[PDB]
Amino acid sequence: QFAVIGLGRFGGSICKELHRMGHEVLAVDINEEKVNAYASYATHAVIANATEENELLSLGIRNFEYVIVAIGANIQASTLTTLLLKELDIPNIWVKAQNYYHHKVLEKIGADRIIHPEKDMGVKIAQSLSDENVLNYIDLSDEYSIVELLATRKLDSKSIIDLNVRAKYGCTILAIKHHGDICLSPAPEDIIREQDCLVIMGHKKDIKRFENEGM
């Protein structure tokens, strides 16, 4: 189902994770040490130069629905591989882009998805930096947001009704997380300890106010 062609910082991580999730993954790399290191983290692992057409055929690359081209540094290799993958009619080709220029040729040679990992992680880090309290969020509208909050101290050993969040800020607490054991829909008396995960829902400004005052 999945082949990952570059086992580096990025490709290796995709590989390890797909495998941990339970999908079958073919790990490909030109470097023998890398292939050895990923033997345990992939269904199969093979030494191959992904820029070599017969080597790609030998991997049985067409038997794959998704091929990820994760060779970062070598722009030539990356596009040459992508080029070959498009020739072999691969349904989904995802490629890591090195820079603006690399993005542009990948776009034209028919990459299905182009990833800028650092750029994307930049946004995520900035999101983290601006509200440290928020671990995760989902934007429902311009105005509404579901927010996973890490409990700052003053919120310690307090029940739902202790700070009633429906009356005060007009937000609904969706869950509590204690010990990797969750309280899915809390009763009015359920204790929130420090470092429990609050899941809160409603108006963005109301949550932000609750953060300002209850934390």
Report the binding-site residues for NAD(+): 9, 29-31, 49-50, 71-73, 96-98, 102, 118
Confirm or reject binding of residue 24 to its own copies (CB under 8 A): no
Q: Which of residues 139-198 bind its own copies (CB under 8 A)?
A: 139-144, 146, 148, 172, 174-175, 177, 180-182, 184-185, 197
Among 8, 88, 158, 191, interactor with its own copies by CB under 8 A: 8
Residue with tokens 């990025």: 10
Which helix (H) or strand (E) element contains residue 129?
helix 117-130
Q: What is the DSSP string of 137-199?
A: EEE-SSSEEEEEEEPPGGGTTB-TTTT-HHHHS--EEEEEEETTEEESS--TTPPBPTT-EEE
Confirm or reject binding of residue 28 to its own copies (CB under 8 A): no
Q: Which is nearer to ligand ADP, 33 or 142 (CB)?
A: 33
Residue with tokens 């890490």: 150
Number of residues that bind ligand ADP (CB under 6 A): 24
Q: Which of residues 49-68 bind its own copies (CB under 8 A)?
A: 66, 68
Please state the length of the chain: 215
Q: Which of residues 98-117 bind ligand ADP (CB under 6 A)?
A: none
Which helix (H) or strand (E) element contains residue 69?
strand 66-69
Question: Is 198 within 8 Å of 183 (Cβ atoms)?
Answer: no
Burial of 108 (0-12, 13-18, 19+ CB in 10 A): exposed
Among 37, 53, 74, 92, interactor with ligand ADP by CB under 6 A: 74
Among 26, 61, 67, 70, interactor with ligand ADP by CB under 6 A: 70
Confirm or reject binding of residue 64 to ligand ADP (CB under 6 A): no
Confirm or reject binding of residue 118 to its own copies (CB under 8 A): yes
List residues binding ligand ADP (CB under 6 A). Answer: 5-11, 28-31, 34, 48-51, 70-74, 77, 96, 118
